[PDB]
Design a protein around this nucleic acid. Structure first.
Ligand SMILES: [Cl-]
Ligand SMILES: [Cl-]
Ligand SMILES: [Cl-]
Ligand SMILES: [Cl-]
Ligand SMILES: [K+]
Ligand SMILES: [Mg+2]
Ligand SMILES: [Mg+2]
Ligand SMILES: [Mg+2]
Ligand SMILES: [Mg+2]
Ligand SMILES: [Mg+2]
Ligand SMILES: [Mg+2]
Ligand SMILES: [Mg+2]
Ligand SMILES: [Mg+2]
Ligand SMILES: [Mg+2]
Ligand SMILES: [Mg+2]
Ligand SMILES: [Mg+2]
Ligand SMILES: [Mg+2]
Ligand SMILES: [Mg+2]
Ligand SMILES: [Mg+2]
Ligand SMILES: [Mg+2]
Ligand SMILES: [Mg+2]
Ligand SMILES: [Mg+2]
Ligand SMILES: [Mg+2]
Ligand SMILES: [Mg+2]
Ligand SMILES: [Mg+2]
Ligand SMILES: [Mg+2]
Ligand SMILES: [Mg+2]
Ligand SMILES: [Mg+2]
Ligand SMILES: [Mg+2]
Ligand SMILES: [Mg+2]
Ligand SMILES: [Mg+2]
Ligand SMILES: [Mg+2]
Ligand SMILES: [Mg+2]
Ligand SMILES: [Mg+2]
Ligand SMILES: [Mg+2]
Ligand SMILES: [Mg+2]
Ligand SMILES: [Mg+2]
Ligand SMILES: [Mg+2]
Ligand SMILES: [Mg+2]
Ligand code: NA
Ligand code: NA
Ligand code: NA
Ligand code: NA
Ligand code: NA
Ligand code: NA
Ligand code: NA
Ligand code: NA
Ligand code: NA
Ligand code: NA
Ligand code: NA
Ligand code: NA
Ligand code: NA
Ligand code: NA
Ligand code: NA
Ligand code: NA
Ligand code: NA
Ligand SMILES: [Sr+2]
Ligand SMILES: [Sr+2]
Ligand SMILES: [Sr+2]
Ligand SMILES: [Sr+2]
Ligand SMILES: [Sr+2]
Ligand SMILES: [Sr+2]
Ligand SMILES: [Sr+2]
Ligand SMILES: [Sr+2]
Ligand SMILES: [Sr+2]
Ligand SMILES: [Sr+2]
Ligand SMILES: [Sr+2]
Ligand SMILES: [Sr+2]
Ligand SMILES: [Sr+2]
Ligand SMILES: [Sr+2]
Ligand SMILES: [Sr+2]
Ligand SMILES: [Sr+2]
Ligand SMILES: [Sr+2]
Ligand SMILES: [Sr+2]
Ligand SMILES: [Sr+2]
Ligand SMILES: [Sr+2]
Ligand SMILES: [Sr+2]
Ligand SMILES: [Sr+2]
Ligand SMILES: [Sr+2]
Ligand SMILES: [Sr+2]
Ligand SMILES: [Sr+2]
Ligand SMILES: [Sr+2]
Ligand SMILES: [Sr+2]
Ligand SMILES: [Sr+2]
Ligand SMILES: [Sr+2]
Ligand SMILES: [Sr+2]
Ligand SMILES: [Sr+2]
Ligand SMILES: [Sr+2]
Ligand SMILES: [Sr+2]
Ligand SMILES: [Sr+2]
Ligand SMILES: [Sr+2]
Ligand SMILES: [Sr+2]
Ligand SMILES: [Sr+2]
Ligand SMILES: [Sr+2]
Ligand SMILES: [Sr+2]
Ligand SMILES: [Sr+2]
Ligand SMILES: [Sr+2]
Ligand SMILES: [Sr+2]
Ligand SMILES: [Sr+2]
Ligand SMILES: [Sr+2]
Lengths: 237, 56, 73
RNA sequence: ACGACCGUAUAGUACGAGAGGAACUACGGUUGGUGGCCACUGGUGUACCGGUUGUUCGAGAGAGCACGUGCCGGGUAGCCA
RNA sequence: CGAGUGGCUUGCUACCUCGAUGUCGGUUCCCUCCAUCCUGCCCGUGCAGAAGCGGGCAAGGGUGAGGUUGUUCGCCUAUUA
RNA sequence: GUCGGGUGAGAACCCCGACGGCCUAAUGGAUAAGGGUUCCUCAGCACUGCUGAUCAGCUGAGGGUUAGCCGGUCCUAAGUCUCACCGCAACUCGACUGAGACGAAAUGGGAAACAGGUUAAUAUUCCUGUGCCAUCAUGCAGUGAAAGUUGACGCCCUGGGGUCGAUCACGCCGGGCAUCGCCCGGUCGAACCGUCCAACUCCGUGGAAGCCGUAAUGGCAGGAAGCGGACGAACGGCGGCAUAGGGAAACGUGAUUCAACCUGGGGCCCAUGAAAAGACGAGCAUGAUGUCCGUACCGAGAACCGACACAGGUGUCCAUGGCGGCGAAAGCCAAGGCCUGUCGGGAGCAACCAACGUUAGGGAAUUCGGCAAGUUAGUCCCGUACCUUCGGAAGAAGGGAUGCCUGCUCCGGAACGGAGCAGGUCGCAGUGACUCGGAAGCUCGGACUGUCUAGUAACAACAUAGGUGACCGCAAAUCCGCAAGGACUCGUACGGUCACUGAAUCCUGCCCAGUGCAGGUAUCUGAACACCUCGUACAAGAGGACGAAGGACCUGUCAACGGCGGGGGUCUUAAGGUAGCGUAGUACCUUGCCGCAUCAGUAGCGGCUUGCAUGAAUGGAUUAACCAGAGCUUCACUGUCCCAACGUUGGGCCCGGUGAACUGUACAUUCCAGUGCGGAGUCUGGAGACACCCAGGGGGAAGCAAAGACCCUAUGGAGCUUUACUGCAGGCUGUCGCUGAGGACUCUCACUCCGGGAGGAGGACACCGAUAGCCGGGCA
RNA sequence: CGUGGAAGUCUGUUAGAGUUGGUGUCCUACAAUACCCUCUCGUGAUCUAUGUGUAGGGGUGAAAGGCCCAUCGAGUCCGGCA
């Protein structure tokens, strides 16, 4: 047969890549030596092509101009702070240790200093639950309880743009425009709508998968399609 | 549209040109490589044993 | 407000579009001053036509349910 | 190169209780086929004559173009049914 | 039950054609066969008549229009000698 | 095209005039690519040119392309290459990371040129006039100088400013016409220098509690109007430039609508609409320098691609010439171009054919099917059903009007803008041509716009929004690479991957036995290393002990693959078909039965329906809207038909010139029969038959064109499949190495990751190398 | 009632794109996919020029086994090869 679409993907050809050259900024936590002493003023609010959500342009005291992953409620003129002794206000960034429990956080680091990994999409947020001298437990947007190093920096508040998913695309044209801003091949032809040569589910005189859809985790690329290592399927039971 | 005559009329692009190294009109001006002598690809001259019968 | 869609898309689609856009187009009280002068500038971007306060908020609402929770705690 | 049918008289007669109901022959017409012809009716008739829209030749007069007549009305000969 | 004729149906066979003899139905145009549907002439009748029924000679001419269906076939309608 | 004429040995087609035509987003003008001398001149006709040629894109010889200010050159874009580094058995191979370079000629950014004149051929290049830019030198000024501004930007609507053009009025110059007095052309003049400034923003004054303002949104005591002011636009106005230039002459002035250009306001995004060089910021004189490359011509029904002087294909700007009208529409006409979509002569010019016009009465009877053709039509008024997701349906349907002429009214600043009124009046016909919908109903399918088999399929197929399930916390899931490495990803669960279903609405039953996936697991099974026994002075080898993933076994799971019967008043194998729908695009029987409709209806629709063999995201039902989708009915219309006729244009036929191809074992005037390998012009018997030629429609040569696609055969091929055979990747798992200290555990020092770093997390694991077991059509 | 001017919105041979029927014309063609009329789309998932990337068991594919220079159920060239 021929390599399936999932295999063409990995080659990183133009069709499968994201329009990086059109992307604005790699929104990471500003690095501070120590002491915390660092603040900046929100100069503007911009649209982020890579995330379909707003982003704040912030100018710091030392003269550094950088785009920031803006939480909800941040506006031009506001003063944001970043450091161990930062003020516990929305928009400020400080390690999980200095962040009081029960407070919503976003753009959490996985390893102290990485610049932020978790809770970065529209409207989401992580819940800071437990404190300790060794570990700070956080509840990520997926519902998973994540034990983290209390030194991991994080921003206060929920990511701006919440509710984006509430409105339907309505028509293909709208999807088209969004897709064009991401690293994704669209539209999607169903495997079952292809020829045997093109996909495991292809062929037949009528459209239906060959074998069952639940495929073993050990399946090789070219065959791993359908329901990857599903613990169950359907809605009932 | 036919792949034949009708599709021939758009062919006004220049690719293969006289090669600075070998003199053959095979220097692909887009790729900057000579399909005949390998100029632009290798210091050594392009040559292959299959260019002649195995016993020659 | 989904009349631009004519007889296409079905109830749900154009019904939720009309709502989301209605509440989006509503007069919004600016956080800076107090006047109902906040208009959407783009996806998640809002601004007061009075004091010029430009700020971030929900994609279609200037403030989201989870956004209000932030203040509280 | 002619085939077939209908109608009238025969006749409300022969036959028959009645109901019903022929023929020989003589006529008139129809249908299908055939050959020919155009006085008559009909079609055509970018021969011709007229009306008239747009535009061009300044108007007028008189003309060109609008697909092999712009369109509309009438239509001779011939050819035709 | 027995004897046949035909070569329209079907089957059988594998002679002919696989360096190709273009399909079914329809159409159009031409010729033919008779086991005759009508028309001519006849015989019988459970032939009064009228209308039939069965049979003989006979291939000159005729055997048309339509509804469903790709249909051939067939079903149906109204005309018809 | 035609009549004259010119040149010439020769003229239908080379040139001149006249008459007649063709082209209007092109058949005109400027160009990109591409061509490459095709451009100009002279001389020619052997070649090329669908005939001819005195002509030519042909032949030969000469000639022709002139730049500080037009392009290139410079900048950076998607991206490319080079070097270093690393991989690889190796490289001309390979990903990343660094550095460098490359990457835009119409059409990205960008220092500066306009007007006229000139040649056979160049021209913002030459020449004349005027102007401008950059660098440098000198002199003077200036010490400022880098923050900032610019370069520099999406889609939709819209205001204002405003030039060209077009038109109107009046004047002047010239032409035309001659029943009038109308019609046509012209009435010029740049770059540049100087000056003017609307919009936006801001300041002062002022002091609105309801006013100010817009096409629209809107604005304000956080200070509205008004008044004054700062900054501030055009490729625009104005003055110069200009006793420059140009014109035979006049050598205008006002207006309207206003492309270009300038400047504002509004709206939209699950879409956010380049970068760099450079410039400004940052003066003036005088002078010097401004090199290098391109520049001809074609740009197409003859200069390009398509073998051709090919009816094909091929980007940009001229989108403002006149009438017309809604119009960048038709039709007609300018400017400009052309008679080279390049063979002619002749015959009332037959048959036949291609395009096409008109046909009486009938009116779909034609046909698989109204295929083909036709009908309708523009604009205003009236009026408009079922259904419906309330948007729509809808231009539903149906009805009326429509010209010209005279005089007017209304809206507006006005138009050579629009809406009406009264009177008069002509035709068969007033959207008079042109332009220009036929309409209605029932059913099936897909919701919709969209996609597709370049070249027989445009569909119901694909996509889609919507619905759903699966995987994954990022040192992730998924995927590419042998490796070094990489896409996703400037991304982080409101994510993105992998699949299914396919808008909305009402819904989506039962089954986990088999198969798949996943989880668990006492016990059973389960390889290699190490370990133990036997064996061998060692070794091969035999056995044992321990036992990972996996399997057995257990459980979960069907919007996983799939299933939803036979029998009787349970059995196979888990369940035994729920809502619905149903003779279906699924129903064999079958033209099922009843009804509707028709003279007549295997059709269509409705009802019934025991369903050969319907049925619920293998989605069921249903549905407004949409459709070059399938079927059916009606009105209207008609040469589709009854049944054909006449006509128009190009052919056909005859003449001049040019001049192929297909095909050919031989013989050949055949016909009827027969025979023969059973389908004979050629054998046999007869019949017929004087030769040659022209036109015809195609009966035969089992006509010509193709070593049958069908079918079989060959120990033929290939693509595809799988619980076929055998293997190979890949995933999981144990073990050895890296690998270290004190049956579970602690630690840090290798190693890995995070962190600029200090340092943090992890850690003998992981990675990597090796081997073993399992899964393994992903691949051979 | 007006204003406003939305839309994978409608009419449209505007430009441009496409290709339903005629099973017309052609079928030793004008043409190895053409001609005419008819027909669909025509503010968007639009069309288009140039530049650039992806390469052969590999691309690319709104999926037709479509397309990758008249070549595709595995391009083309040469070689293995007689
Ligand atoms: Cl999405
Ligand atoms: Cl009849
Ligand atoms: Cl140039
Ligand atoms: Cl405005
Ligand atoms: K055969
Ligand atoms: Mg970031
Ligand atoms: Mg979704
Ligand atoms: Mg993309
Ligand atoms: Mg799909
Ligand atoms: Mg398919
Ligand atoms: Mg198929
Ligand atoms: Mg497969
Ligand atoms: Mg399906
Ligand atoms: Mg399916
Ligand atoms: Mg034959
Ligand atoms: Mg007899
Ligand atoms: Mg006879
Ligand atoms: Mg000459
Ligand atoms: Mg010239
Ligand atoms: Mg020519
Ligand atoms: Mg008639
Ligand atoms: Mg019939
Ligand atoms: Mg038709
Ligand atoms: Mg007035
Ligand atoms: Mg049906
Ligand atoms: Mg559709
Ligand atoms: Mg096709
Ligand atoms: Mg179609
Ligand atoms: Mg979906
Ligand atoms: Mg989804
Ligand atoms: Mg579908
Ligand atoms: Mg029925
Ligand atoms: Mg179900
Ligand atoms: Mg053969
Ligand atoms: Mg076969
Ligand atoms: Mg095989
Ligand atoms: Mg790292
Ligand atoms: Mg195989
Ligand atoms: Mg391209
Ligand atoms: Na017999
Ligand atoms: Na036949
Ligand atoms: Na007879
Ligand atoms: Na019949
Ligand atoms: Na000629
Ligand atoms: Na000026
Ligand atoms: Na006009
Ligand atoms: Na559309
Ligand atoms: Na099961
Ligand atoms: Na079923
Ligand atoms: Na469509
Ligand atoms: Na006719
Ligand atoms: Na013949
Ligand atoms: Na194959
Ligand atoms: Na309104
Ligand atoms: Na067509
Ligand atoms: Na290949
Ligand atoms: Sr990051
Ligand atoms: Sr970082
Ligand atoms: Sr399949
Ligand atoms: Sr269920
Ligand atoms: Sr081209
Ligand atoms: Sr190279
Ligand atoms: Sr070599
Ligand atoms: Sr009588
Ligand atoms: Sr009587
Ligand atoms: Sr005429
Ligand atoms: Sr006889
Ligand atoms: Sr008889
Ligand atoms: Sr038969
Ligand atoms: Sr039958
Ligand atoms: Sr000669
Ligand atoms: Sr010439
Ligand atoms: Sr360059
Ligand atoms: Sr340029
Ligand atoms: Sr545009
Ligand atoms: Sr204006
Ligand atoms: Sr030139
Ligand atoms: Sr030109
Ligand atoms: Sr052309
Ligand atoms: Sr074409
Ligand atoms: Sr002219
Ligand atoms: Sr000629
Ligand atoms: Sr007439
Ligand atoms: Sr009919
Ligand atoms: Sr009929
Ligand atoms: Sr009407
Ligand atoms: Sr449906
Ligand atoms: Sr196509
Ligand atoms: Sr649905
Ligand atoms: Sr199971
Ligand atoms: Sr039931
Ligand atoms: Sr003989
Ligand atoms: Sr002939
Ligand atoms: Sr549209
Ligand atoms: Sr067809
Ligand atoms: Sr033709
Ligand atoms: Sr053809
Ligand atoms: Sr036609
Ligand atoms: Sr349209
Ligand atoms: Sr060979």
């Amino acid at each position: 047969g021929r390599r399936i679409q999932g295999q063409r993907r990995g080659r990183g050809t133009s069709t499968f890549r994201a329009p990086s050259h059109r992307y604005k900024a790699d929104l990471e936590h500003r690095k501070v030596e120590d002491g915390d002493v660092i603040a900046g003023t929100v100069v503007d609010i911009e649209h982020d092509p890579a995330r379909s959500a707003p982003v704040a342009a912030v100018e710091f005291e030392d003269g550094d101009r950088r785009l920031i992953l803006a939480p909800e409620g941040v506006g031009v003129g506001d003063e944001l702070q970043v450091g161990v002794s930062a003020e516990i206000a929305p928009g400020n960034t400080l390690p999980l240790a200095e962040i009081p429990e029960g407070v919503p956080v976003c753009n959490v680091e996985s390893s102290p200093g990485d610049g932020g990994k978790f809770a970065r999409a529209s409207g989401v947020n992580a819940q800071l639950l437990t404190h300790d001298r060794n570990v700070a437990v956080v509840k990520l947007p997926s519902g998973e309880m994540k034990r983290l190093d209390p030194q991991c920096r994080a921003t206060i508040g929920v990511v701006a743009g919440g509710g984006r998913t509430d409105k339907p695309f309505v028509k293909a044209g709208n999807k088209h425009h969004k897709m064009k801003a991401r690293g994704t091949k669209w539209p999607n032809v169903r495997g079952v709508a292809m020829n045997a040569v093109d996909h495991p589910f292809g062929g037949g005189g009528r459209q239906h998968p060959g074998k069952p859809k639940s495929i073993s985790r050990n399946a090789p690329p070219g065959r791993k399609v359908g329901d990857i290592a599903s613990k169950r399927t359907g809605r009932g039971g | 549209t036919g792949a034949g005559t009708p599709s021939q009329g758009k062919k006004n692009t220049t690719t293969h040109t006289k090669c600075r190294r070998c003199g053959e009109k095979s220097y692909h001006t887009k790729k900057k490589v000579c399909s005949s002598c390998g100029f632009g690809k290798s210091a050594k001259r392009r040559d292959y044993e299959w260019q002649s019968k195995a016993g020659e | 407000s989904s009349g631009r869609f004519g007889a296409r898309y079905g109830r749900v689609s154009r019904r939720r579009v009309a709502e989301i856009e209605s509440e989006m187009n509503e007069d919004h009280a600016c956080p800076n001053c107090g006047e109902d002068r906040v208009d959407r500038q783009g996806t998640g971007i809002w601004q007061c036509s009075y004091c010029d306060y430009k700020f971030t908020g929900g994609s279609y609402k200037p403030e989201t349910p989870g956004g209000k929770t932030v203040r509280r705690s």
